[PDB]
Amino acid sequence: SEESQAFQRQLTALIGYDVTDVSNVHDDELEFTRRGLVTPRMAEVASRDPKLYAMHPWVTSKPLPEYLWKKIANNCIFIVIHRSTTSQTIKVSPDDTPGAILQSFFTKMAKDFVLRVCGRDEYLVGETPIKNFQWVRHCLKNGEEIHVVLDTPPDPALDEVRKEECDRKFRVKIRGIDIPVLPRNTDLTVFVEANIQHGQQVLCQRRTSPKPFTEEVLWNVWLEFSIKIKDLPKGALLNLQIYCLLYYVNLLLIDHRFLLRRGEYVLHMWQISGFNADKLTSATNPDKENSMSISILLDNHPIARAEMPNQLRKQLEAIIATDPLNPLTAEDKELLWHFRYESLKHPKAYPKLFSSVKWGQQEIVAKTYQLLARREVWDQSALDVGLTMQLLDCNFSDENVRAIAVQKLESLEDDDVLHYLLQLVQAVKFEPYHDSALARFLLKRGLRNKRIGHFLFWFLRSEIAQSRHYQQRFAVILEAYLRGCGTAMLHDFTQQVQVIEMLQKVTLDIKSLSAEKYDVSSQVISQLKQKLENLQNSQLPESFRVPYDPGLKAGALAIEKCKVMASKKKPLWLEFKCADPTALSNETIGIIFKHGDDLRQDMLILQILRIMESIWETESLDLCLLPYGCISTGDKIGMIEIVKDATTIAKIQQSTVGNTGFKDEVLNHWLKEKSPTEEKFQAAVERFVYSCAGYCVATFVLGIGDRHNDNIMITETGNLFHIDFGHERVPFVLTPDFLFVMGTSGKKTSPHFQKFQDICVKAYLALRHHTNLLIILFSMMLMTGMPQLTSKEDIEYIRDALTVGKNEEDAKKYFLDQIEVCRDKGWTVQFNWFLHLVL
Numbered sequence: 001s002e003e004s005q006a007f008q009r010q011l012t013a014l015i016g017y018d019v020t021d022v023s024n025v026h027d028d029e030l031e032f033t034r035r036g037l038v039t040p041r042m043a044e045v046a047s048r049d050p051k052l053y054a055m056h057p058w059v060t061s062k063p064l065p066e067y068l069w070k071k072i073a074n075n076c077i078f079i080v081i082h083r084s085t086t087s088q089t090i091k092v093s094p095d096d097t098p099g100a101i102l103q104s105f106f107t108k109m110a111k112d113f114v115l116r117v118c119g120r121d122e123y124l125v126g127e128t129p130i131k132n133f134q135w136v137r138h139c140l141k142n143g144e145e146i147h148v149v150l151d152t153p154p155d156p157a158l159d160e161v162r163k164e165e166c167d168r169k170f171r172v173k174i175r176g177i178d179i180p181v182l183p184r185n186t187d188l189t190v191f192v193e194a195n196i197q198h199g200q201q202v203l204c205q206r207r208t209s210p211k212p213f214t215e216e217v218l219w220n221v222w223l224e225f226s227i228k229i230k231d232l233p234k235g236a237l238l239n240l241q242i243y244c245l246l247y248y249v250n251l252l253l254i255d256h257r258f259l260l261r262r263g264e265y266v267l268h269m270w271q272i273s274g275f276n277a278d279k280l281t282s283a284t285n286p287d288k289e290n291s292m293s294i295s296i297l298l299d300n301h302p303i304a305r306a307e308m309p310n311q312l313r314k315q316l317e318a319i320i321a322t323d324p325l326n327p328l329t330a331e332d333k334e335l336l337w338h339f340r341y342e343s344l345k346h347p348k349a350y351p352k353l354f355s356s357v358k359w360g361q362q363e364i365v366a367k368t369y370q371l372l373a374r375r376e377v378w379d380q381s382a383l384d385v386g387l388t389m390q391l392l393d394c395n396f397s398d399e400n401v402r403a404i405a406v407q408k409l410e411s412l413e414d415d416d417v418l419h420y421l422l423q424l425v426q427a428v429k430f431e432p433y434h435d436s437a438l439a440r441f442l443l444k445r446g447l448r449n450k451r452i453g454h455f456l457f458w459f460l461r462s463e464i465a466q467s468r469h470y471q472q473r474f475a476v477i478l479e480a481y482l483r484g485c486g487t488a489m490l491h492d493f494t495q496q497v498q499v500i501e502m503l504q505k506v507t508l509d510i511k512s513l514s515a516e517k518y519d520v521s522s523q524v525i526s527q528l529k530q531k532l533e534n535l536q537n538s539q540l541p542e543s544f545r546v547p548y549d550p551g552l553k554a555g556a557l558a559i560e561k562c563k564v565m566a567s568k569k570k571p572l573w574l575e576f577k578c579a580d581p582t583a584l585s586n587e588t589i590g591i592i593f594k595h596g597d598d599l600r601q602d603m604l605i606l607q608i609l610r611i612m613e614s615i616w617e618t619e620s621l622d623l624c625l626l627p628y629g630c631i632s633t634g635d636k637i638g639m640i641e642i643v644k645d646a647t648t649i650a651k652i653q654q655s656t657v658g659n660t661g662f663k664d665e666v667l668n669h670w671l672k673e674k675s676p677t678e679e680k681f682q683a684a685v686e687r688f689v690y691s692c693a694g695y696c697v698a699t700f701v702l703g704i705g706d707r708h709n710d711n712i713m714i715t716e717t718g719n720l721f722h723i724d725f726g727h728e729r730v731p732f733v734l735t736p737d738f739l740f741v742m743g744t745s746g747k748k749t750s751p752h753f754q755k756f757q758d759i760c761v762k763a764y765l766a767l768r769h770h771t772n773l774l775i776i777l778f779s780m781m782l783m784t785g786m787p788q789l790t791s792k793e794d795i796e797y798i799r800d801a802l803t804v805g806k807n808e809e810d811a812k813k814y815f816l817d818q819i820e821v822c823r824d825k826g827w828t829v830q831f832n833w834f835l836h837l838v839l
């Protein structure tokens with residue numbers, strides 16, 4: 001077809017990669033995966049209810065936390081419905097349905113339709129209490145009145161999807177290596193290391209003889225491995241590495257058709273920088289010109305209970321109780337394996353059990369499959385996301401193991417998917433094959449719910465733009481999604497892509513008008529405005545969805561308010577009009593636009609923050625973190641949400657006291673001067689003690705607590721919040737000025753500080769109840785979000801931070817010391833940031 005080719009060229013520009021391309025291939029897994037994904041796509045497309053799809057009610061089935069019940073002291077809730085300008089308030093009970101409110105309106109007042117929130121593409125529809133809508137719980141928590149317009153359901157037809165119509169030792173022959181341009185050092189020796197890998201576990205290892213490092217090195221050696229051919233498990237990687245460690249590539253021993261991989265290969269390798277997820281990719285380097293290569297030959301068809309004593313059961317259960325980062329001894333492993341059936345009765349044993357498996361042994365693998373045949377206990381246990389994530393990490397390369405984890409995820413309501421989506425997407429980096437239960441799960445869930453669908457797009461596009469290690473895989477997944485999201489969403493994405501391309505192609509030019517002499521002259525700010533007013537007319541779209549808040553529709557630029565800012569990089573501060581006529585307020589949408597940092601680390605941190613909040617919700621705690629919108633759109637560059645009416649703490653202090661200097665009161669004065677009534681001031685000191693506590697606990701746990709005061713902000717209403725997670729010591733930032741607000745000054749105790757301490761201990765202990773989930777997220781963040789990181793140095797930090805294996809009193813004691821360490825030195829580390837600027 002011809003109207004199918006434009007559509008392909010449409011999808012390419014949306015994706016940022018061309019998936020028809022075959023240049024960087026050596027087999028057909030990608031195309032196979034495109035074809036494979038058609039079925040599950042169409043199964044979810046055919047399945048979804050058009051009506052509920054179009055309106056995508058954002059809904060939860062969690063209870064309602066104690067601290068928001070207190071905010072409805074009457075079993076009634078106030079909703080204000082509108083038409084033109086005609087408006088009326090309605091008495092509603094928490095258990096009322098959108099259905100039970102329409103008649104409480106129509107049958108109540110006379111002189112079909114649906115309830116949409118003012119200023120947003122967000123709806124209150126479907127069989128759910130209003131108390132179980134997200135927009136409603138937000139309105140409460142924020143002290144805000146719910147505002148909603150009456151109009152029609154949006155036409156489901158707008159979401160019309162288009163139309164698609166042996167038994168011997170294994171051997172590998174190393175021929176040679178070659179880099180087109182060598183020049184680097186008195187080149188040491190150089191050898192090839194050939195690992196047979198499965199789940200980061202090396203099953204077998206052979207090397208070449210060491211030879212000189214010229215731009216062409218040879219061997220012609222057959223390397224014989226200890227493993228037999230029938231002993232190879234599906235998912236096994238031939239991992240080929242160059243030491244002198246500087247280069248790596250991987251080739252799957254068994255392909256997507258269960259065939260043993262045979263023949264000649266010329267593989268272009270990746271270079272080490274200066275363990276992590278990049279080291280695992282089946283993708284070869286596409287830069288065939290600059291990159292080191294390797295040549296190999298494969299010639300080698302398809303794939304082929306009683307009662308336990310006492311003290312051992314104790315020993316077993318000790319092992320099972322232990323944390324995800326506890327090393328399993330050989331003794332521990334054999335214990336688990338020999339008593340696998342007894343181990344199978346404990347859903348928590350599963351990770352340690354399945355890493356007690358000798359995957360290099362064919363007959364044991366089989367027994368493990370038989371073992372997985374009786375899933376009774378597993379299938380009936382409640383969802384433990386933490387358990388499930390463990391099975392999706394770099395430690396498991398077996399499809400059956402991985403699929404039981406994907407099975408458990410099915411029972412997640414879309415609310416919870418949204419919480420774990422970034423990390424489920426990053427977990428895709430740990431899949432041996434392009435077609436996985438996990439990729440498909442993301443596809444299904446993505447297409448069933450537009451909100452998920454939106455974030456799935458941006459999450460995948462972030463990686464496609466930024467890493468060659470996985471861009472091909474993620475691109476095939478993105479195409480699968482785009483092919484079913486609907487014409488309405490395709491148009492939307494198109495809008496959004498245009499805008500950010502246009503806007504980034506302005507962040508560049510501007511940044512190069514001063515390298516390090518930051519000082520934004522009139523010559524700079526004016527030409528910025530000239531670009532935008534040029535853009536406004538005949539290129540920049542009418543209205544785009546705010547990528548980090550798909551609810552809000554942004555309209556026209558407000559040129560006058562735009563700027564560059566004092567930052568040592570040069571980020572755009574941009575403000576937009578809302579395109580929604582019904583918008584309750586006339587306030588602008590602020591979006592920062594920043595080039596120079598890798599925003600994916602900021603994404604991973606923010607999202608764990610949201611997780612940490614919901615974790616706290618489970619125990620009726622609120623720490624009012626402000627996890628600001630932040631989306632990585634392209635390479636080294638992406639957008640951020642402007643929190644209105646906030647300023648940096650350092651910037652606050654550089655208004656009263658010189659520049660090099662500090663002083664302790666200025667925070668509290670700044671608060672009193674920006675809050676009108678001394679009550680709204682107390683509402684601010686309130687907000688401060690909670691927000692402060694939260695960022696202290698969260699921050700310590702992730703070991704990102706030692707920050708320079710310019711990296712912490714506060715709102716005009718008391719809410720403190722860390723920013724720019726782009727990358728002697730202090731556990732967190734609790735400085736004298738903070739303490740001054742709490743009614744304390746250098747080594748004493750006060751009622752707000754007594755509270756502060758109290759809420760901290762309570763917040764900490766709460767996270768400790770979810771220890772395992774946090775350990776796995778952290779290490780996955782480390783493996784999929786950074787350069788190189790250590791498998792017991794970087795990660796093993798969080799065991800200690802969360803104080804694994806302690807009684808609550810120890811834990812509380814431990815944390816309260818950290819509070820006191822910050823006390824000792826108060827301004828010490830702070831001052832140092834400026835001292836280093838000369839040492």
Ligand SMILES: CC(=O)/N=c1/[nH]c(C)c(-c2ccc(Cl)c(S(=O)(=O)NCCO)c2)s1
Nearest residue numbers: 571594628642643644645646710711723724
């Ligand atoms: C009014 C105001 O300053 N609002 C803001 N709110 C937020 C969350 C801001 C923010 C958040 C993150 C980042 Cl990364 C930045 S930034 O201006 O790009 N970086 C400055 C380095 O410290 C600014 S700026």
